[PDB]
Amino acid sequence: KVFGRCELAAAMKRHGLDNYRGYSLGNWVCAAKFESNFNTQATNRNTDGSTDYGILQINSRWWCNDGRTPGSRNLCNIPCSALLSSDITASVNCAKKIVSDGNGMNAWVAWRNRCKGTDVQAWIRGCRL
């Protein structure tokens, strides 16, 4: 599923991501735009052989099981395919674990490089939330 901007903002808010660990909703929408273009079916292979999955490009090196990342962990206790669903629940619940691990949203390199320190509220401007 390819979400609309406000559509994704509303889903993320409903699932408790607005201000989670202090990150306002716009930060999460910005991250998703540059990680996946709001497409839940996004995948990308990393140089180390792990793969990133879903709207927030969650990595199989640590967070999910894809059966093809030797030596990896599955800290969200989910198949990586769950992260591609039209329902963002699994991605949101896993993102909450990620952002709580100590480095906040710097875990998302695209957030650090394209969202951090920018006017992220622009990403939710005009939405009925």
Active site residues: 35, 52
Question: Which residues are annotated as part of the binding site for substrate?
Answer: 101
Residues in contact with ligand IKX, shown as a per-residue x/- string from 53 to 92 under the rule CB under 6 A: ----------------------------------------
Q: How many CA atoms lie within 13 A of 49 on its CB side?
A: 8
Site for Cl ion, residues 45 to 104, rule: CB under 5 A: 59, 62, 65, 67-69, 73-74, 79, 87-88, 104
Residue 81 interacting entry, from Na ion, ligand IKX, Cl ion, none, C-beta within 5 to 8 Å by type: none
CA distances from 78 to 9, 34, 58, 100, 116 (A): 23, 23, 11, 18, 28
* Cα radius of gyration rounded to whole Å, the chain: 14
Helix then strand count (H, E) for the chain reads: 4, 3
Piece of 2-10, 54-62, 85-93, 97-105 that binds ligand IKX (CB under 6 A)? 2-10
6 binds ligand IKX (CB under 6 A): yes
Q: Which DSSP helix (H) or strand (E) runs through 76?
A: none
* Interface with ligand IKX: number of residues (CB under 6 A): 7
